[PDB]
Amino acid sequence: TLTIDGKNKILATLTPTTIILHNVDPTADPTANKVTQPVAIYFSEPDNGLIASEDTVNITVPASATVSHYSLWDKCVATGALSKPQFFEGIYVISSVSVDLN
Amino acid sequence: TLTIDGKNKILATLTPTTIILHNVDPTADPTANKVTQPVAIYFSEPDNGLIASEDTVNITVVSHYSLWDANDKCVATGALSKPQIYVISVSVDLN
Amino acid sequence: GTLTIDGKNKILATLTPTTIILHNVDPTADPTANKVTQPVAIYFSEPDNGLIASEDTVNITVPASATVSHYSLWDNDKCVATGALSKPQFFAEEGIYVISSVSVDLN
Amino acid sequence: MWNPIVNVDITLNTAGTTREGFGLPLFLASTDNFEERVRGYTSLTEVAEDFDENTAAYKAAKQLWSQTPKVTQLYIGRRAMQYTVSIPNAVTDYSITVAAGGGISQPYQYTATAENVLQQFKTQIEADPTIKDKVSVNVTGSNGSATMIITKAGDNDFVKVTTAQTVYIASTTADTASTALAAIEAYSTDWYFIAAEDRTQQFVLAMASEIQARKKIFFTANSDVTALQGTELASANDVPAQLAKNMYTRTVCLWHHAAAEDYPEMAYIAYGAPYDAGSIAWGNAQLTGVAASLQPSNQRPLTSIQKSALDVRHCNFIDLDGGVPVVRRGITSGGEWIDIVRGVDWLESDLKTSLRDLLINQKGGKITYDDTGITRIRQVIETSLQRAVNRNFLSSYTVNVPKASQVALADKKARILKDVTFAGILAGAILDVDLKGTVAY
Structure with missing residues (x-):
């Protein structure tokens, strides 16, 4: 039952630099089934135990x-x-992606 | 939906050092309602999203x-x- | 043998396009073939130096x-x-194509 | 209305004088207290009205005006915001209010899973006669993990969400360094120094590269303890080390333990901002109220070894004389003295203004493409350089222009003059001294 301060301190240490898409579920094996090459993503500062990407990704x-x-x-x-x-073929548009502890 | 590796990354930085008990819920306000004095407590390394106390604080x-x-x-x-006297026969979980 | 700047300025004032359409093939053939989108209004400004520019963006x-x-x-x-x-x-799905600005020239 | 013949007012406060120089600071904060993306302030009192004491914008604005003479004016930029709304408990009343630019506000309500509740709000907003064209809404998640996203849309630049304890509201910055900077420049370009509230590694490096392409200076602080270890720049990987690797000459980094919640950089900006550009050395600066850099572990002043670690990283620090703190070097991350960068920017703006007086304003008429016109270009350029010499920024110069009888006749049809060049000799200054002596009978 962490307080907001604990959630904010925790989330500040997540630094996901890139994203990759998969056709098969990567939860069991995240190393295989690469569909697209890595694409850089940017994340904001934590607030109320939540973060989101600052801009769109193509x-x-x-x-x-x-x-x-x-x-x-x-x-x-x-x-x-x-x-x-x-x-x-085409361009897939990813809007803000949020990571939450709530 | 963080993986186990991410959760291990996370808990390593969240390191508490003392515990205080209250007669009333401190979640609304962690300052008042303090009945005891700061008592040191230690924790092990994270694993599967869990960190457990090394000794049962008294x-x-x-x-x-x-x-x-800190x-x-x-x-x-x-x-x-x-x-x-109260005996703390405790862990923090992300599940 | 060349038109003066005055001639170009007089000439451009008659071209008054007001709509734009997109195609998936070059419309250099029959211009109404391979139409892909509905027409969208577009405006142009006064001719200066033999060149006209679009007034505003078009979605x-x-x-x-x-x-x-x-x-x-x-x-x-x-x-x-x-x-x-x-x-x-x-x-791959519905979206927006943006024309920031387009100009017509006689130079 | 009736006025007294003589009106007198006296107060027991204390006031100090201001002074004018080159460039005004800007603070890029994450806030939503006002619509416009930039707003000016002339005293800490005005900042206190739209910001409380614990806000980051208030801390930075307080540090800036702690020096003397005081900076004439500070701007506070605003960052785009997005809100995420989610239900934190069971489902069984819910209402929120959304604001937009121009004061347009429309409350919404749906009195009854979480997903089935948010979808009601999404349809209401999209069906509202107004505001729908100005904002974007989105819902995702199933049953108990339902969530909503609201962001700026269309020409509208401002959006807010508030509230019903059953509705949980979160906020986060939406724009990156590049997008944020472009938006602010299109509104107001009257500013030279830039500092930002956000201190993430990803954001700072992005902002540094963006400013490197423009003509500004980006002041930032750092408190990463890893910067104090090692003496090879190749091996280092902290934020200051990366900045020096890329040779960014327009970014100034200051190491200070208190740089986590406080903003000591704005104090450093106020040291030189009040004065004219190019005639001030930024080293050996004294700052009022700023304590010397200390090791987080034991609150001791940094040792000689740690200072050398910052030197190879081209990072400033608050050294210690015999009891007096001083920012010693004042060099940018590219190894160039600050006063060199500031002076070059002022000179490059004075030259542009003078030339545009001839090309655009047409004082004395248009310029011909014979030796008569080229001599006029020589005179305007020389005058600006002489202005630099008067400040003691330079000590000499030379100017060279092409002969009108030798320029290729292709440029004469393009009305473009090339091959105009000059050179200058810097004045220099003294910051350190070395001495030796002997004693004997």
């Missing part, structure tokens, strides 16, 4: 590929499933 | 508690097992 | 799953200009 999905999930790297620190899978 | 005299770090900032709060 | 809605590789300007419909976009773009 990713080039290769030909005849599909995207299902994502994984953060800096080593890997997090993974998650996209709001909806999409069979495109 | 506190001299409440139904509440509040952890503190710079006078409260980091956790909650209620004890029973209201009422 | 064009690209239908989902469409592709854009070219464009054309239209008036009273006659297509007065054509050209290729800076890059063929694959809008």
